Amino acid sequence: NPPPPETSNPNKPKRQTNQLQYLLRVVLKTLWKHQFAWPFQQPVDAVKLNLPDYYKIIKTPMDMGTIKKRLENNYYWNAQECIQDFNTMFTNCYIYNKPGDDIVLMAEALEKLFLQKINELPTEETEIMIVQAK
């Protein structure tokens, strides 16, 4: 099993804006308690699930746990890359699996809810906190 994506970087700055705060407190909150949230709350354990070719095909793995801990530690710079992480999770599920599979339908429902919630995003980004690299 490959290591999970980093959630903190000493060479990267730490930023918190109103949109990232919203993504953590509303979007990630409401997608975490969704009924179809469990297959995307952990990194894909390709060893354990008989999926040896998974990381040949998913070159950027992503899960709601990694995104959650990235938002908690203020690892992101702005909201766009957190939204990109969510979209990468959904697209990883899509590319890896088949359009009629149950997990693809679950990811599609999650993505629809996510797109609604991010449509409810604050339009103007306001910086709350910034810390330079250590």
């Binding site: 297959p39 894909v44 699930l49 999926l51 699996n97 599979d101 149950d102 997990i103």
Partner: peptide, 12 residues
């Protein structure tokens, strides 16, 4: 573990 095959099902 029974509650594991449920994981292995929705990721054929």
């Amino acid at each position: 573990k029974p509650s594991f095959y449920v994981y292995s099902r929705v990721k054929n």
